[PDB]
Amino acid sequence: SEQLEQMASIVSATRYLKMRCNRSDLPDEQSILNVANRIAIGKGWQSLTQEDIRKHSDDIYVRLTRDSTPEYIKCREFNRRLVPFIGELLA
């Protein structure tokens, strides 16, 4: 599912920021998943569950850690790209 792929990618990138890019300001995993579930339900996505998003996000995260891009560039790319989602997270 592309909606699941999308949501899971946003959640895994946010985990990457928290774990490897010092983003102490971001909410916890439960909060992030709640917000992803809220967002999905607003977008009319009824099939997506927090467990589906969480499981796929785990798998994406592993792929992200293994990617040979320098870690600091990963951080810079995600910090720029997640600005909208982080606004929903902190709202």
Least gap, CB of 55 to Cl ion (angstroms): 10
- Minimum distance from residue 67 beta carbon to Cl ion (Å): 10
Residue closer to Cl ion by CB (options 9, 21) is 21
Residues that bind Cl ion (CB under 5 A): 21-22, 49-51, 70-71
Least distance from Cl ion to the Cβ atom of residue 5, Å: 17
Q: Which is nearer to Cl ion, 21 or 39 (CB)?
A: 21
Long-range contacts from 76-82, C-beta under 8 angstroms, 24+ separation: 78/13, 78/14, 78/16, 78/17, 78/21, 79/17, 79/21, 79/23, 81/13, 82/10, 82/13, 82/14, 82/17
